Design a protein around this ligand. Structure first.
Ligand code: 04C
Ligand code: MG
Lengths: 231, 195, 222, 244, 235, 212, 233, 240
């Protein structure tokens, strides 16, 4: 009310309204799902269009051969943060000949987002990210929020009506976690998960976006006719 | 570059400047005009390091032209020469100084008098009846000491100048391919085409 | 006074065929009169069917290859996974090299691959970024030994048709990969004989539309 | 952050006016009146000191009239402290010009630069403008005797006779009435003092509440002299014109 | 007042949303993409009859293979075009090739959110970027001050946009010829424009692989206007 | 290097050799020393290969930006001055360039500008630049007339490079010919000195110093 | 631009079937003055890497601090700091190689020759060299300074190529290293008798041996040498 | 440095600071530009509440940017000096690098760009100035007349006016100016310019300034008597 003019101001109950309004931009964004087994990690994203004449806004971005994310909210902010991740992954490779741990990737995003919530003039990032990767400790899935809070999970979902997919994955937890050495089945579980967030619209060929990374699989994105298999 | 001369007579200033541009063992050009008009009644000749010369001349030219447009008024030759000297005086203590020597010939319309200024790359200014830069001076100064008179006409000044060019063509080691002569007087700047 | 440069010896060689290209280089690494390694590769697959070698001062060579490999990576990120063409790679490398015009990378660089028509391509660079596409180039310590042999055997220089009174030149033709590898092996054994910084092993990278293949051969170790 | 306390000094009103410039002019309208009158053979500068105290040291005082160089002077109306900042800049600018060209600075060039500085404070920087209006009185060999005025907006104009500060409306009407082009310095002196005497908010105009100056070619042959009047000299000139 | 980079309670940047209102006030610009080329057309909209309409430059070349049309606060577009041209030429210098239309658009859109308390406010202009490259062929992009860009088969921006877009929805198909697209832009522009459409208050342009980006002459457009009126009367 | 370009009745001839050297080592015989900036502008290269190659390519990018911004092809004077002002900024740093900016525009007509790395910029009708410039001058000057035909001018340019290619140890390879008209530049082929010398010797009867 | 003051001489090393061996004497020379005798020039990083350093000792001590700090920094927010995300020899080397090349490029080098010996997580032997110029190379045997000229020839008789590594045991390898250290003591004027030796094995792990001495030296034949030519007495 | 974003969007999509800068232009004295067949004429109003002025030294309303281009304006006087100075500097810089004086379009484009930059830069307000830029391109005899405004938009005009009561004089010019036949001579062009100002001015005494620009750097300002003759002639034809 009087305490939402900028990020540098606390409310009387200890809230940061600008950070909460940034969180609200994610809720308006299109649904995206993340889930993993012990061998592979999968992103599934529902893409959104302006109208029937437009393209479908790309939701998934590659960060390295072994890491990448999906976005929900302000896409330009995802571009800034993904670019930062690309550089950090790249610094780790050039300097230490070391693939950046997915956990460190999360820590770096957390600290970058935080600085924007404590200084005058700046603003919080207006996007949520689901980072998947495969590193020296196996498959991983992270959830980034622009408050700074990063969380490691077996599965999750962000965006509009994400609660449907998040409930489904919470039920399916024991099943999909043991889909080891089988990419197509783990994707199927993710495609079924995102289907719990659909209303009036269904998954079409230029609507669905899937990404996968794993033990013997570089981070690769599937669009167009390549996702027709899963509808 | 190399030879630039200047003679102030009764009613005008006459500048002579060699036409040769040499680089190594090749005379690349024999029709080079080593001068810029700074204002309608002010002419500057120049000689020195390659590149520096023209870059400096055109830089001064741009500044004097800027002043003229701003004030709708022509700076006196004395004022222009002082501006030029100060730019060279700054330059000499720069990281890379302009290695350019200049003569400034002008007609002061307020005084109705011709004025010749000799300024070297250090920023050493002197007003003179006759001036020269480089090795030219070693022949022309003594020659002009003898033959120059302060009340001479423009025609007498040109004959006096022919005498200098002849002496230089006789005794100078290098072929400087003749000179372009220009006259600065009450009616402005004009070029003598047959010299 | 500290001298930032050194000479790590060795030599490299690139030849282009009709539908392939080879980039060869010996595996010896030296300083002064000592051998540092008998097998230290300096010919690298950089992705997008581009092979590269920067011979001379190894620290600068490795730095350059590392930067170009990284340039290929960011080219994909910034231009929707588009394939970096060999001509575009060449121009990019010029800027990498010329960027250090006043503190140069002490290396003779050669890249090889296929052009956008599928034909074999070799590009070669000086230490400060000047480049040129050729059928043929030797680089490094033994470049002066090998290059004239390549002029004669790849481009048929100074060879005339017998009985034509030195009037008709030997016609230019593409060489088979079998013939090219024979020339590479003979070039390197000859260079090994007469140049002290060349020897130990030979590693050839062959580039066709199918990918990048390797071949290794022993060289004299003295 | 600090946005909360920013007055925004360099913005437009909905009517297209600069608030701070308008309010600075309102401030200046309460300052002691200063008058400049340009004659054919010289310039007069006359200014009224702001309500004087009898214990004020009058002879060693300077409030209104300042010397910029040997050929140019200014009359001030507004904040004195602000004026001195600008005067020292103007003095330095004149010396830069003399150093560069070996010629005394033309009056307009000096006036333009000082006015350009004022302009800058109205367009950028977020600072308050200078609460000062100047009357410039000077001579050069191009235009001869010149009078200018500049104000907080950084706008300047040339004049034959002009007033700044308090009661300019009344003062300008009186100057417009009695001024004529073939006027001499001694006549202009009388006009300046008569105008102040009628527009003054004081009971009667006296020597101790005035600063006075002339710029004549009344030196010896083709050269200009600046005369900043002493207290006794103002007392005499006030008697000579029959005001006291 | 309030911060320039402030979020609304609905999760949108105030300034970006307000700049979108400025674009709705702008003159209409329409783009249509075909397999034979991309057509760009704009409403000039002279404020007075004394203004020489040919000096109104709302269609602009970025490179030989990329063109651009604008709508909104058109003065803001100058630095966007300058950047686009430099980006296009710079890429050709570094890589000895033409730059992808998408990569160009992305480079322009990177400027968009570089505002705050960088420039003081978002751009008040939307751009239609049309071009061709070897990879993705003929393309049309709509670049906004939000930093977002969409690829379009057809798109209208400006005051008559929502009406024109609904018309483009019906008329566009994947087998349109270049000539069909030219007439379609003229037709839809004539519908949404205030004043009567002619060669002086409307301008056409296209980009083709063969001839590159070309702004049409007033003589050429006049014939297409005459061809359009005759065809509508013919049924 | 030996490069030349001269003005005449029928426009501009531009001729260059194709050798690159690293000391006494012949680095290349097939180097390209003319850069085609646009259909009406040419640039010749002499001196440091990288310096010439890098900055004249860069010059081409600046000329393209001019015509995008100004909706008009850049003048030869303005194009040359971009390059000369650039190298002047680097004066002392050790750039090595001897270049000639040759081209046609409506306002200028056929124009040639000499630009070097010390900041010298000269308009002129005839220039020869490079280590073998003097050898080219000898032949070119002694056969030059304004009224040469396009056929004779092309040959003289070719013959002047051949002269320098022969005598100058750091020139050779092949001759690249160009002809600039009001309609733009026209390429007139690559001519290997290996064949051209003997062809010229036989047909012309010159080069009697050589064992036939 | 530097000049080295207190210096360390040769560092020698080689690969064997299960791991790597590295050695270096305990001397800190001050020109011709053999100033310091308790200097450790082999520095372990974790339980899988040993960095051997020759050249300037002040710069060596700086590098020690960097490696020490690298361990600390790697442990931060790293639950697998003693497991999957522990510092590998290849990570430690690439870091040093980067620093060395950056410092030479700023014309202010760390005046050292460095050999990083260790065993990777997959069991592979790691052995690579880097110096003040940023020059890097790898070989079955590696040595710095005089070691390059005298040790390498001896060590290459045991492991002359890659295929000789599986055929070489830790007993044979250590024997060759200890012999090489003796030869260096005979012939290098800036070497000492006391030295340290480290074995990094993929089974038995890191074994760090301190206060070793060169022994079984041949000096007896010296009694028979008289004058420099003609002297019989 | 002072960073505040002064020019910003409002809910309706307007930048009020730019629009309030237009109000400053509307307050300024009237300026008019009319281009003929072989000339351009710049006319300017001077308010007559200022008597005792010294017209020798008072800044003229029309300024030379180069010998071939001129610039008149309406709005804040102090602001105009900053634009004129920058324009004059760019004019000399263009001659220095391109070896050719600026075109009128280029010089206009530069001035318009400066004005635009002050509408989305932090810490600054827009220029309260609209300009009329007139002249002839080098080696060209086609007359050029351009207008700029605080927002940064610029365009070419056959004839145009800016400042106070500009809508009245624009109304006059819109019916009195024929595109098919512009003022064929200098006299015709000056007269049409003076006529248009007489719709708004008051007295044709020392209130109207006229500056005529012709091809090849031929610019001259008319004196009082010369202008007064046009005023006298127009009034006598009016009484009909
Ligand atoms: C003739 C052959 C005489 O040199 C020409 O000038 C020729 C010009 C030329 C221009 C464009 C393309 C090809 C050829 N110049 C050279 O071939 C040139 C000679 C030269 C060498 C060094 C120089 O620096 C003082 C200046 C001129 N050769 C090269 O540039 C060779 C290929 N490269 C190098 O020598 C690499 N050096 C350049 C300087 O920096 C260190 C590395
Ligand atoms: Mg040997």
């Amino acid at each position: 009310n009087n305490y939402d003019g900028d990020t540098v101001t606390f409310s009387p109950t200890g809230r940061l309204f600008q950070v909460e309004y940034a969180l609200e931009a994610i809720k308006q964004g299109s649904v995206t799902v993340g889930l993993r087994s012990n061998t592979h990690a999968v992103l599934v994203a529902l893409k959104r269009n302006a109208d029937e004449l437009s393209s479908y806004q790309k939701k998934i971005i590659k960060c390295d051969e072994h890491m990448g994310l999906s976005l929900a909210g302000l896409a330009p902010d995802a571009r800034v943060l993904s670019n930062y991740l690309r550089q950090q992954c790249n610094y780790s490779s050039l300097v230490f000949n070391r693939k950046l741990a997915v956990e460190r990737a999360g820590h770096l995003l957390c600290d970058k987002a935080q600085k924007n919530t404590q200084s005058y003039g700046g603003r919080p990032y207006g996007v949520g990210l689901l980072i998947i990767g495969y590193d020296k400790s196996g498959a991983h899935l992270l959830e980034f929020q622009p408050s700074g809070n990063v969380t490691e999970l077996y599965g999750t979902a962000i965006g509009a009506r994400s609660q449907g997919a998040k409930t489904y994955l919470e039920r399916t937890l024991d099943t999909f976690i043991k889909i080891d050495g089988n990419p197509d089945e783990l994707i199927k579980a993710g495609v079924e998960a995102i289907s719990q967030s659909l209303r009036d619209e269904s998954l079409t060929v230029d609507n669905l976006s899937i990404a996968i990374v794993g033990k013997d699989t570089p981070f690769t994105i599937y669009d167009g006719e390549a996702v027709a298999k899963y509808i | 570059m190399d030879i630039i001369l200047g003679i102030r007579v009764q009613d005008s200033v006459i500048l002579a400047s060699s036409k040769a541009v040499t680089r190594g063992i090749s005379v690349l050009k024999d029709s080079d005009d080593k001068t810029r008009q700074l204002s309608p009644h002010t002419l500057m000749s120049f000689a020195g390091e390659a590149g520096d010369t023209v870059q400096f001349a055109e830089y001064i030219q741009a500044n004097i032209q800027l002043y003229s447009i701003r004030e709708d008024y022509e700076l006196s030759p004395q004022a222009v020469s002082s501006f030029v000297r100060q730019e060279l005086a700054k330059s000499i203590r720069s990281r890379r100084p302009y290695q350019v020597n200049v003569l400034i010939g002008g007609y002061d319309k307020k005084k109705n008098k011709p004025e010749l200024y000799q300024i070297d790359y250090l920023g050493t200014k002197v007003e003179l009846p006759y001036g020269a830069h480089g090795y030219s001076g070693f022949y022309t100064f003594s020659l002009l000491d003898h033959h120059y008179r302060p009340d001479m006409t423009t025609e007498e000044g040109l004959d006096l100048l022919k005498l200098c060019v002849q002496e230089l063509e006789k005794r100078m080691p290098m072929d400087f391919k003749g000179v372009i002569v220009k006259i600065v007087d009450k009616d402005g700047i004009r070029q003598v085409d047959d010299f | 006074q500290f001298n930032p440069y050194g000479d790590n010896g060795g030599t490299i060689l690139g030849i282009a065929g009709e539908d392939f290209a080879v980039l060869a280089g010996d595996t010896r690494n030296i300083t002064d009169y000592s051998i540092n390694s008998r097998y230290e590769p300096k010919v690298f697959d950089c992705g997008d069917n581009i092979v590269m070698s920067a011979n001379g001062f190894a620290a600068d060579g490795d730095a350059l290859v590392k930067r170009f490999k990284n340039s290929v990576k960011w080219y994909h990120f910034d231009h929707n996974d588009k394939k970096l063409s060999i001509n575009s790679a060449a121009r990019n490398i010029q800027h990498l090299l010329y960027g250090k015009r006043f503190f140069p990378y002490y290396v003779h660089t050669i890249i090889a691959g296929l052009d956008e028509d599928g034909k074999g391509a070799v590009y070669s660079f000086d230490p400060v970024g000047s480049y040129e596409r050729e059928q043929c180039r030797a680089g490094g310590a033994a470049a002066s030994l090998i290059m004239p042999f390549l002029d004669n055997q790849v481009n048929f220089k100074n060879q005339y048709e017998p009985g034509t009174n030195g009037k008709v030149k030997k016609p230019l033709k593409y060489l088979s990969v079998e013939e090219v590898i024979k020339l590479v092996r003979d070039s390197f054994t000859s260079a090994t004989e007469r140049h002290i910084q060349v020897g130990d092993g030979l590693e050839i990278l062959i580039v066709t539309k199918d990918g990048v293949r390797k071949e290794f051969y022993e060289l004299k170790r003295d | 952050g600090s946005r909360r306390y920013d007055s925004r000094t360099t913005i437009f009103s909905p009517e297209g006016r600069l608030y701070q410039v308008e309010y600075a002019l309102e401030s200046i309208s309460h300052a002691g009146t200063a008058i400049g009158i340009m004659a054919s053979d010289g310039i007069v500068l006359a200014a009224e000191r702001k309500v004087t105290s009898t214990l004020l040291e009058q002879d060693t005082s300077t409030e209104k009239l300042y010397k910029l160089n040997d050929k140019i002077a200014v009359a001030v109306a507004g904040l004195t402290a602000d004026a001195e900042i600008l005067i020292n800049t103007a003095r330095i600018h004149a010396q830069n010009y003399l150093k560069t060209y070996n010629e005394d600075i033309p009056v307009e060039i000096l006036v333009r630069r000082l006015s350009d500085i004022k302009q800058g404070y109205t367009q950028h920087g977020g600072l308050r403008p200078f609460g000062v209006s100047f009357i410039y009185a000077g001579y050069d060999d191009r235009y001869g005797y010149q009078l200018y005025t500049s104000n907080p907006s950084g706008n300047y104009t040339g004049w034959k006779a002009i007033s700044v500060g308090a009661n300019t409306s009344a003062a300008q009407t009186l100057l417009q009435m009695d001024y004529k082009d073939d006027m001499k310095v001694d006549d202009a002196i009388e006009l300046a003092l008569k105008t102040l005497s009628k527009t003054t908010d004081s009971s009667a105009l006296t020597y101790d509440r005035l600063e006075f100056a002339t710029i004549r070619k009344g030196a010896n042959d083709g050269e200009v002299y600046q005369k900043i009047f002493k207290p006794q000299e103002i007392k005499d000139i006030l008697v000579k014109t029959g005001i006291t | 007042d309030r911060g320039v980079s402030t979020f609304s309670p609905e999760g949108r940047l105030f300034q970006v949303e307000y700049s979108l209102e400025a674009i709705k006030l702008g003159s209409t610009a329409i783009g249509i993409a075909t397999k034979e080329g991309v057509v760009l057309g704009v409403e000039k909209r002279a404020t007075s009859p004394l203004l020489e309409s040919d000096s109104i430059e709302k269609i602009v070349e970025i490179d030989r293979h990329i063109g651009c049309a604008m709508s909104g606060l058109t003065a803001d577009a100058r630095s966007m075009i300058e950047h686009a041209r430099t980006a296009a030429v710079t890429h050709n210098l570094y890589y000895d090739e033409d730059i992808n239309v998408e990569s160009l658009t992305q480079s322009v859109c990177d400027l968009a959110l570089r505002f705050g308390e960088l420039m003081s406010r978002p751009f008040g202009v939307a751009l239609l970027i049309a071009g061709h490259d070897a990879d993705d062929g003929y393309q049309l992009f709509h670049a906004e001050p939000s930093g977002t860009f969409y690829r379009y088969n057809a798109k209208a921006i400006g005051s008559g946009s929502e009406g024109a877009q609904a018309e483009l929805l019906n008329e566009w198909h994947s087998s349109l010829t270049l000539k069909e697209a030219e007439l379609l832009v003229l037709k839809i522009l004539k519908q949404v424009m205030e004043e009567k459409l002619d060669e002086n208050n409307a301008q056409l342009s296209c980009i083709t692989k063969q001839d590159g980006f070309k702004i049409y002459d007033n003589e050429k457009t006049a014939e297409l206007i005459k061809e359009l009126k005759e065809k509508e009367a013919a049924e | 290097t030996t490069t030349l370009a001269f003005r005449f009745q029928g426009g501009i001839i531009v001729a260059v050799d194709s050798r690159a050297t690293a000391g006494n080592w012949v680095a290349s015989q097939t180097v390209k020393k003319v850069i085609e900036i646009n259909p009406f502008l040419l640039g010749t290269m002499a001196g440091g290969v990288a310096d010439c190659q890098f900055w004249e390519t860069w010059l081409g990018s600046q000329c393209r930006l001019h015509e995008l911004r100004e909706k008009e092809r850049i003048s030869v004077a303005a194009a040359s001055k971009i390059l000369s002002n650039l190298v002047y900024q680097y004066k002392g740093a050790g750039l090595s360039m001897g270049t000639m900016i040759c081209g046609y525009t409506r306002k200028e007509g056929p124009t040639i500008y000499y630009v070097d790395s010390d900041g010298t910029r000269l308009k002129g009708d005839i220039f020869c630049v490079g280590s073998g410039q003097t050898f080219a001058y000898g032949v070119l000057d002694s056969n030059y007339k304004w009224d040469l035909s396009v056929e004779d001018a092309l040959y003289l340019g070719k013959r002047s490079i051949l002269a320098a290619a022969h005598r100058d140890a750091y020139s050779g390879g092949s001759v690249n010919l160009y002809h600039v008209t009001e309609d733009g530049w026209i390429y007139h082929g690559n001519h290997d000195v290996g064949e051209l010398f003997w062809k010229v010797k036989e047909e012309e009867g010159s080069f009697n110093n050589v064992i036939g | 631009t530097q000049q080295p003051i207190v210096t360390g001489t040769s560092v020698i090393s080689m690969k064997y079937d299960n791991g790597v061996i590295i050695a270096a004497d305990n001397l800190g020379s001050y020109g011709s003055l053999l100033r310091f005798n308790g200097v450790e020039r082999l520095i372990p990083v974790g339980d899988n890497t040993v960095v051997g350093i020759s050249g300037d000792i002040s710069d060596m001590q700086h590098i020690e601090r960097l490696l020490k700090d690298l361990v600390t920094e790697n442990a931060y927010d790293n639950p697998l700091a003693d497991a999957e995300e522990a510092l590998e020899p290849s990570y430690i080397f690439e870091y040093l190689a980067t620093v060395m090349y950056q410092r030479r490029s700023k014309m202010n080098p760390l005046w050292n020759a460095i050999i990083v010996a260790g065993v990777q997580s997959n069991g592979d032997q790691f052995l690579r060299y880097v110096n003040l110029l940023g020059v890097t190379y790898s070989s079955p045997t590696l040595a710095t300074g005089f070691g390059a000229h005298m040790a390498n020839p001896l060590l290459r008789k045991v492991v002359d190529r890659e295929s000789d590594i599986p055929k070489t045991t830790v007993q044979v390898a250590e024997e060759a290293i200890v012999n090489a250290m003796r030869v260096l003591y005979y012939r290098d004027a800036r070497s000492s008798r006391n030295f340290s030796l480290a074995i990094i094995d993929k089974n038995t792990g890191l074994t760090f041996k301190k206060n070793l001495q060169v022994e079984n030296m041949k000096w007896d034949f010296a009694k028979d040498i008289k004058g420099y030519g003609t002297q019989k007495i | 440095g002072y960073d505040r974003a002064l020019s910003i969007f409002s809910p309706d999509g307007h930048i009020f600071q730019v629009e309030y800068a237009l109000e400053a232009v509307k307050r300024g004295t009237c300026a008019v530009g009319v281009k003929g067949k072989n000339c351009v004429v710049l006319g300017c109003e001077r308010r007559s509440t200022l008597k005792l002025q010294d017209t020798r030294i008072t800044p003229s309303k029309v300024s030379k940017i180069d010998s071939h281009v001129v610039l008149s304006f309406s709005g804040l006087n102090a602001d105009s000096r900053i634009l004129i100075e920058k324009a004059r500097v760019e004019a000399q810089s263009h001659r220095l690098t391109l070896e050719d004086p600026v075109t009128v379009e280029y010089l206009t484009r530069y001035v318009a760009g400066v004005q635009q930059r002050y509408t989305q830069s932090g810490g600054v307000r827009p220029f309260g100035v609209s300009t009329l830029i007139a002249g002839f391109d080098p080696r060209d005899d086609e007359p050029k007349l351009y207008q700029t405004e605080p927002s940064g938009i610029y365009s070419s005009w056959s004839a145009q006016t800016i400042g106070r009561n500009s809508k009245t004089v624009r109304e006059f010019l819109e019916k009195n100016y024929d595109r098919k036949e512009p003022p064929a001579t200098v006299e015709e062009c000056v007269k049409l310019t003076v006529r248009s100002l007489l719709e708004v001015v008051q007295t044709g005494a020392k209130n109207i300034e006229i500056t005529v620009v012709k091809p090849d750097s031929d610019i001259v300002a008319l004196s009082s008597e010369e202008i007064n003759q046009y005023v006298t002639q127009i009034e006598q034809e009016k009484q009909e």
